[PDB]
């Protein structure tokens, strides 16, 4: 066919007995032609008369109201004098589980780190804005019981629920409810959101436990190994530097090796070792200290060893 054809991986699950809207999932670069919807088979177009339940309006598929028997495939075609693309979407309509104000299959997972103030957003309400560009007044619930939006503990602003001082006690399945007036009639809207609290984990920085800005009596013409012992994530960068320069492979006297050991109790505190093998002590080595650097996104850490002649 003279049309690109594409299938959407994302399957949106909606609630039955409620109004629902489905837009044609096209990237900005695919909005040149008019969109036209079709049902299970790419030849049968969806009704255009707003009076019927499943009908197309404003280039979107409307289920006024949606019913379980509507679960299936639909197609939206973007055609133009010299372009045509057909997307195969998948819609599924469920019903609230026994004595529950929602169905698990429609849960959107939303998380926030504790201690601070955060917000949950009632998904896909954008389609239901009145002609004056306002989203309908939402009423929030937590685990099917009403939620007091006292502007002190919870604040309902537009399409989001601002939660003051997130804590474990806020975990639960919230449901945002709304009522959209379509062609005189009024239909309900609900989205179930599972709120998960994240424990604020510390941004650990690499710690050099050895060397510790010390000196070492070494004889001329001998061979030594300078070991750098760092504690941190295995992903941390630990390396040696001499006179503000890094050890290059082309150095016939200075060769370094790297080896780390994972901590079986806490991966955040594993050991990273960087050994500097000095084949032979040269005069220049006593002129400047060997510095070991450890770093990551958070910060860097430095420690050195200053070689000295034995007294």
């Amino acid at each position: 066919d003279k049309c690109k054809e594409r299938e959407e991986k994302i399957i949106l699950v909606s609630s039955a007995n409620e109004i629902d809207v489905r837009p044609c999932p096209l990237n900005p670069n695919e909005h040149k032609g008019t969109i036209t919807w079709y049902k299970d088979d790419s030849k049968t177009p969806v009704s255009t008369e707003q009076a019927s339940r499943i009908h197309q309006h404003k280039e979107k598929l409307w289920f006024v109201p949606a019913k379980v028997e509507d679960s299936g495939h639909y197609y939206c075609v973007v055609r133009n004098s010299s372009y045509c693309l057909r997307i195969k979407i998948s819609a599924k309509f469920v019903e609230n589980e026994p004595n529950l104000c929602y169905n698990a299959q429609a849960i959107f997972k939303q998380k926030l780190p504790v201690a601070g103030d955060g917000g949950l957003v009632c998904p896909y309400m954008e389609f239901f804005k009145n002609e004056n560009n306002e989203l309908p007044k939402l009423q929030w619930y937590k685990d099917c019981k009403p939620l007091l939006l006292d502007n002190i503990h919870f604040s309902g602003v537009k399409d989001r629920l601002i939660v003051m001082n997130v804590a474990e006690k806020h975990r639960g399945n919230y449901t945002c409810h709304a009522s959209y007036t379509y062609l005189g009639k009024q239909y309900p809207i609900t989205r179930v959101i599972e709120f998960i609290t994240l424990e604020e984990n510390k941004p650990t920085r690499p710690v050099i436990v050895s060397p510790a800005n010390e000196t070492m009596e070494v004889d001329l013409g001998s061979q030594i190994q300078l070991i750098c012992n760092v504690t941190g994530q295995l992903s941390d960068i630990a390396y040696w530097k001499w006179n503000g320069s890094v050890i290059d492979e082309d150095d016939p006297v200075l060769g370094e090796d790297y080896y780390s050991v994972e901590n079986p109790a806490n991966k955040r505190r594993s050991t990273l070792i960087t050994v500097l093998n000095i084949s032979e002590i040269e005069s220049r080595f006593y002129k400047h200290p060997f510095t070991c650097f450890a770093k990551n996104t958070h910060g860097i850490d430095a420690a050195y060893i200053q070689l000295i002649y034995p007294v």
Partner: protein, 145 residues
């Protein structure tokens, strides 16, 4: 450079990242589609500077300008093979700025352009020249797995 680490990301409006026609987009994922969430693999250059990528660092995010059109794009380049000393590789680096509990990423190769998502769901992740405008979302929650 050395090693990489997987991070979870989602903007302040709870949108997550996933691929649509091999193009990174932000939207809301439900139970079944939860597996489509893309984690961000990062390799730290220096503190507050890093390379961003997805799929085990097989593809990296970058900023390229066609004439004057600054755009974000995924390239098939292993994150570890990137070097801060190579001029071209600057396009894959971002500067991490932190505002309390949120983070923001500025393009190292395209100064002034920050990573952003749109208010409307299921839109591609892009770069904004005007973080002040507030029309696009520039704040995210960047947490290491």
């Amino acid at each position: 450079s050395s090693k990489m680490q997987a991070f979870r990301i989602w903007d302040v409006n709870q949108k997550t990242f996933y691929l649509r026609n091999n193009q990174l987009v932000a939207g809301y994922l439900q139970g079944p589609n939860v597996n489509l969430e893309e984690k961000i693999d990062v390799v730290p250059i220096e503190p507050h500077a890093l390379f961003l990528g997805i799929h085990g660092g097989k593809m990296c995010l970058s900023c390229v300008k066609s004439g004057d059109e600054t755009r974000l794009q995924l390239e098939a380049v292993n994150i570890t093979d990137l070097s801060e000393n190579r001029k071209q590789d600057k396009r894959f680096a971002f500067i991490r700025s932190d505002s309390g509990p949120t983070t923001s990423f500025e393009s190292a190769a395209c100064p002034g352009w920050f990573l952003c998502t749109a208010m409307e769901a299921d839109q591609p992740v892009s770069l904004t020249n005007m973080p002040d405008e507030g029309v696009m979302v520039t704040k995210f929650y960047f947490q290491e797995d």
